[PDB]
Design an enzyme around this catalytic site. Structure first.
Site, PDB file in Angstrom:
ATOM      1  N   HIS A   1       1.016  -1.487   0.048  1.00  0.00           N
ATOM      2  CA  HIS A   1       0.209  -0.113  -0.222  1.00  0.00           C
ATOM      3  C   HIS A   1       0.720   1.269  -0.218  1.00  0.00           C
ATOM      4  O   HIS A   1       1.818   1.333   0.841  1.00  0.00           O
ATOM      5  CB  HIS A   1      -0.844   0.133   1.451  1.00  0.00           C
ATOM      6  CG  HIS A   1      -1.618  -1.039   1.293  1.00  0.00           C
ATOM      7  ND1 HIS A   1      -3.060  -0.957   1.130  1.00  0.00           N
ATOM      8  CD2 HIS A   1      -0.520  -2.773   1.965  1.00  0.00           C
ATOM      9  CE1 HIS A   1      -3.713  -2.309   1.643  1.00  0.00           C
ATOM     10  NE2 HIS A   1      -2.481  -3.286   1.781  1.00  0.00           N
TER      11      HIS A   1
ATOM     12  N   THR B   1      -7.867  -4.923   4.882  1.00  0.00           N
ATOM     13  CA  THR B   1      -8.097  -3.531   4.652  1.00  0.00           C
ATOM     14  C   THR B   1      -9.225  -4.015   3.634  1.00  0.00           C
ATOM     15  O   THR B   1      -8.847  -1.730   2.932  1.00  0.00           O
ATOM     16  CB  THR B   1      -7.325  -2.872   4.855  1.00  0.00           C
ATOM     17  OG1 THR B   1      -5.623  -3.264   3.643  1.00  0.00           O
ATOM     18  CG2 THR B   1      -6.399  -3.444   6.218  1.00  0.00           C
TER      19      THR B   1
HETATM   20 NI    NI Z   1      -2.886  -5.021   2.092  1.00  0.00          NI
END
Ligand code: NI
Ligand code: NI
Length: 257
Positions: A93, A195
């Protein structure tokens, strides 16, 4: 229907995925002044010597470096975990700017990026069954800051031009994920979730205290990736992070004093 854009980002995900407002959502802020040392914890055991990487895929959200998970080749054990967790993929990310990109935060600090090494509990037989269990996954999260280059990341950076757009993949054999770790395995841990949608509350999070350094050039190449498919208007793959969610009735435990 979900992404990180102007109209389908994290603040909208609850409509299709009501668990987005659940009791054990990730990421969270790690408050180093309230996390408590837990002497019941053990050292991490990261056993990646027999890892078999296979492929790298741009999935329109990030890219995954995929592993052979049909045997105990690359496993995580110990720490807070009971049993054996097999590495299935890693991904990152990251931000559009060096001052954001991580999902977890540390005393509200955002890092430039966050590496997730995703593992599933072999007692559940396959990944798809594991995500339906509260103890199905173990994700090892590692922060990235911009500074020196990370040599062990360079082979990933140099394949990114071949998987610029959503749905592209390339062979990615013989990659050693040990080259992505920091020196120390000191960690924080807490129970949480995926997430990204479907946001399932199936993860034991293990977040390393020590960040790794990557160079500005390495990060810039991540930022050249595209969310879109080939022959579509360009949407840079940046800011593919969910912000911190309420801790609720959880405690974050530290493996170190
Ligand atoms: Ni992830
Ligand atoms: Ni969609």
């Amino acid at each position: 229907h979900w992404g990180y854009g102007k109209h389908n980002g994290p603040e909208h995900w609850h409509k299709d995925f009501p668990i987005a407002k659940g009791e054990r959502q990730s990421p969270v802020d790690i408050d180093t002044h309230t996390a408590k040392y837990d002497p019941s914890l053990k050292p991490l055991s990261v056993s990646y010597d027999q890892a078999t990487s296979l492929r790298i895929l741009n999935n329109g959200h990030a890219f995954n470096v995929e592993f052979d998970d049909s045997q105990d080749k690359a496993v995580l054990k110990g720490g807070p975990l009971d049993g054996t967790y097999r590495l299935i993929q890693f991904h990152f990310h990251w931000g559009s700017l060096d001052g954001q990109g991580s999902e977890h935060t540390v005393d509200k600090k955002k890092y430039a990026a966050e590496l997730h090494l995703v593992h599933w509990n072999t007692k559940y037989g396959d990944f798809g069954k594991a995500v339906q269990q509260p103890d199905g996954l173990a994700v090892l999260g590692i922060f990235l800051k911009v500074g020196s280059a990370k040599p062990g990341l360079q082979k990933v950076v140099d394949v990114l031009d071949s998987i610029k757009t959503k749905g592209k993949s390339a062979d990615f054999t013989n990659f050693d994920p040990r080259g992505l770790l920091p020196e120390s395995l000191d960690y924080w841990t807490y129970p949480g979730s995926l997430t990204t949608p479907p946001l399932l509350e199936c993860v034991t999070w293990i977040v390393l205290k020590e960040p790794i350094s990557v160079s500005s050039e390495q990060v810039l190449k991540f930022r050249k990736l595209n969310f879109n498919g080939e022959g579509e208007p360009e949407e840079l793959m940046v800011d593919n992070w969910r912000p911190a969610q309420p801790l609720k009735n959880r405690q974050i435990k530290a493996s170190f004093k």
